């Protein structure tokens, strides 16, 4: 945590008040009643958005019974509530886009139905999240509103529906728009301003607590609601400034190198929602209050490009999946806003030759924003080019590649990272995008979290220990040599009796060389070294391992003092078997030798 | 008439001294008292449990804004009402089921229904919402009015609250909390704070209607207050307000007890007056009761006296000739006013069925039906009544003989509720079967209300059992009326002067129409003095079935195994006019066609008289 306070430095309340754009004149989308301009913006999305609306002409708005909320308390079941909720939210979002697309009034009755139904609900908070209310119960209490991820999203959608359709709604019956205004005030505007204690707001934040994606996510949703629904200038400025203060807490908490330590799947709702907030704030101040030119924000964006190896494979340290991806439309808009050419071409590359279409789902802002960027992204040329080395020195992540298709990811860190795995000093090797030395990733400390099942030694036969203090020391990257080095000794407990253990990775054009150099206090038990892999693993001769997997072939050359064995790991958990298939392997390297000082060299290269 | 029977029985001060607090008046066992529920339920137990089980996966139905908008767009009520009623019926059935079983199996669904009901902006029907300030068919979250629907919804919610508060609060006390709020917002407060709801009749003046809405809504509100309002000062004020409101209704109906609309509203008119009086009595420990008032007994006995048999009811005015009733209701009302006739009639109306709990959506009638089943089951079926019933102010006369003839006749005036131009008419039934009929109610058209009402054949005296005097029919209007109407009960003679129901053009001084029923025959007479003989009189009779003319002056009618001869003056030429029935509301009663017998003559004179005789033959 560092006090940058970038937003507060861009303005105080008074300054902000002077640049706030009133009466919703900041809105970038045309008027509902502009068949011509919507037609231009939409292009080929039009027919498709109309077709999606047509499928909802007879959609029955789903009631959420009290028992669905009670179920959270009874059994911890969340989906019984969330499925109908999210179905309603998506229906309302789609209908919005379809009516913007068609403009013939045909989807207005269903929009009005969804909006009216939504006001009758006692709350838009998820059943899993409602226990943060005073009562601590999972059922809505009409006496209190809080804000959560869901309720903020629902609020912003409702605000956008109000914004586009109030005029035709009012013609049918003005009480609908009236009650939407009350609902948004009671469930978003007022709680936001009157309750300092919501955990994601990060006011009263002490060391040891979390600030995560909830902060920029909920603040971006609150901000839209104010910008759309609050027409008093003093009230507006106070809320917007409040949001600036709250987001500063997140910006202060995340490391400047810009790595997202939760991975490429958290990216879209962490960095991605910081971006959204900042786009929203810029738009709302006529671009006068903008952090989109800040280099930390570009680095936070580019993590998504750097961390994406290819064909759906991504770097997956911690409790994260080796298969991931991202929203190419979001990535384009984020890249274009921070002037990352790399991000823009990377978005066109992820399209994998498909035409970009409107984002659906239930996030009104991204849906609407997707409409703006479409023609542009369709014009963008696809490439995934990036430097040979990326070095995140505070997060201690290092990516190194060569022109022959090897990509290595390595890390230092500490055994209390977000969604920790005990993995200080580990690496992952990809060849032509395919994992060859892998990181197992996330189940549904289980074994996937143990250093025993990462690409690491068991020093004196002992694994890494969990804990803040169990950490890398002296992590370095030589960007030009493609050398990563760290001392992992302090990640192990006392009984490991190790003074120093340097693990280093050197990638040249032909090979990856892995070294271990150690000094022990006492040689108690033989070291063991493990590697994780998959596919077709053979042992053609002593000191040699061959790995054949999705068209790739390498050899791992290892010291002849070790005995190599392949351990089969059946994957019954589907969240793992959906990535890797039915089984993966741990190669164990074991020995009878025990010395106080020594070293190992391992060499991985492709072969014919 | 300013009877003010309830205000005479107590004022607010008396009331306050006799109200029973803490719902100690409730006549049902505690939910936890399983032995007492089992004894009360009898064979209803397993029936109600099975009905409950059918609803364990019931999905509570949302009502979309467009369903309410549709009333305005097209007049469609059912789009809104069908899911609404389904919800209410499910909630009512689940209450009964859970009372029957007592194991907590239906609690979750009761909770769900209750919570869903709180989230609705309003419980008012779409057709009724346009009485709000905005005059729209969509709820307005800022404002509540009460209607037929919302009152019943409110009462049902109050009963759910009363029975299941404890197991609800075990789950999550916020549900009961929101229920109390909802009932307060939607029933208690509007009832107290708004003096201008049309059905309360606090602003009533001559010309305006008081109808069934009054006792029906008052009785629902009264329940809510007795269940939910624990401040005795607020309770007394509410109850006394309901007494003043319901007095408007009692003042308005005729003391002779005839429901002039006819039997089809009896269940929700006199029957809801009964419900209101029972609730009031229960809530005051019996201290404020009009259940002993002879007028209330006559109101309830009207349902007996007007029910001929086999689904056939007396149907003057715009009313179906087919009707019926809820035997359980009829029994309870009968018992309460000490009417053996009504209690035996209820048994008769069961048609040999065992009495089971009332289902539907009326929580009070469902619960009350549990209390009465065992005794109604024991009651002997009979439909006994005096040979003559004479309603002297409404001017309805029913006369019967031991050989199966039932004659209904009326005086009155051509501005009665749901009026037909029918002063002086009669209807004859033979072993319950209509033989000289009164066509009754058709499907509403634009012409049904307004001028042109009397261009609809069913409304005209031309198509009732009456003369066309100098070829002229009766005219609509308050002063088009009977005079010198008498009934000799001993001799079974009804007589009336119908001259003044006819316009000037009919140029008639007097026309006495009289009905004499003996042990075998009905004699109909006309005796007339015209001002001038313009045109020949015509006399009409309405009938159905198989109509034949074996000789001059004779007609035979055979219908549904009954057979009669009609003897008419040979001066008349008799023709049979076929009336093919396009309208299902008619054809569902009468079949494909009915007939008008026309009796016509070239005679024309200032005075004369006609005799007709109807007797059973073959
Ligand atoms: C119970 C509780 O309070 N747990 C907190 C924990 O909060 C949890 O954080 C999760 C997170 O990963 O951020 C939440 O997961 C996300 O919830 C969303 C709301 O239902 C859902 O929308 C996410 O998925 C995306 O939504 C998009 C849309 O808005 O259109 C889609 O288009 C998108 O592609 C879709 O995937 C969902 N993420 C998932 C499933 O990975 C969860 O609601 C929440 O409970 C806190 O982070 C931690 C912090 O220490 O404390 C716990 O106690
Ligand atoms: C639309 C409107 O306001 N109409 C007013 C009349 O009220 C109607 O009276 C009917 C009646 O009591 O027969 C009502 O019918 C009943 O409705 C309840 C609730 O849905 C239901 O339980 C019954 O089965 C049903 N009975 C029927 C159909 O016979 C109807 O809801 C109601 O709209 C009012 O009588 C007249 C009086 O002047 O005014 C109209 O404006
Ligand atoms: Zn891992
Ligand atoms: Zn009639």
Numbering used by the authors:
A (entry chain B): 26 to 469, 481 to 644
B (entry chain A): 27 to 644
What does the study report here?
Based on the Apo structures of BtPL33HA and BcPL33HA, combined with Consurf analysis, a total of 20 BtPL33HA mutants were made in order to understand the roles of individual amino acids in substrate binding and catalysis. This enabled the structural characterization of a catalytically compromised variant (Y291A) of BtPL33HA in complex with a HA tetrasaccharide. The complex contained two molecules of BtPL33HA in the asymmetric unit, with one molecule containing electron density for which a trisaccharide could be modeled, and the other for which a less well-ordered tetrasaccharide could be modeled. A hydrophobic platform composed of W224, W239, L174, and W242 underpins binding at the +2, +1, and −1 subsites, while no obvious interactions occur with the −2 sugar. The side chain of R103 interacts with the O2 and O3 of the +1 GlcA, while H154 only interacts with O2. N238 interacts with the carboxylate of the +1 GlcA through its amide group, while Y291 lies ~6 Å from C5. No activity could be quantified for the mutants N238A or Y291A. However, it should be noted that although both Y291 and H444 are positioned below the beta face of the +1 GlcA, they are too remote to directly abstract a proton from C5. Furthermore, N238 coordinates with the carboxyl group from above the alpha face, suggesting a role in charge stabilization rather than proton abstraction. This suggests significant conformational shifts are needed for Y291 and H444 to perform a direct role in catalysis.
In bacteria, however, a different strategy employing a class of enzyme known as polysaccharide lyases (PL) is deployed. PLs selectively target glycans composed of uronic acids with a C4 hydroxyl group linked to the preceding sugar in the glycan chain. The three characterized PL33_1 enzymes were all from Bacteroides species inhabiting the human colon: BT4410 (BtPL33HA) and BcellWH2_04512 (BcPL33HA) are hyaluronidases from Bacteroides thetaiotaomicron VPI-5482 (B. theta) and Bacteroides cellulosilyticus WH2 (B. cell), respectively, while HMPREF1181_01744 (BsPL33Heparosan) is a heparosanase from Bacteroides stercoris CC31F (B. stercoris). The enzymes are 68% identical and contain a larger N-terminal α-helical (α/α)6 toroid domain (residues 21 to 401; BtPL33HA numbering used throughout this section unless specified) and a smaller β-sheet C-terminal domain (residues 402 to 635).
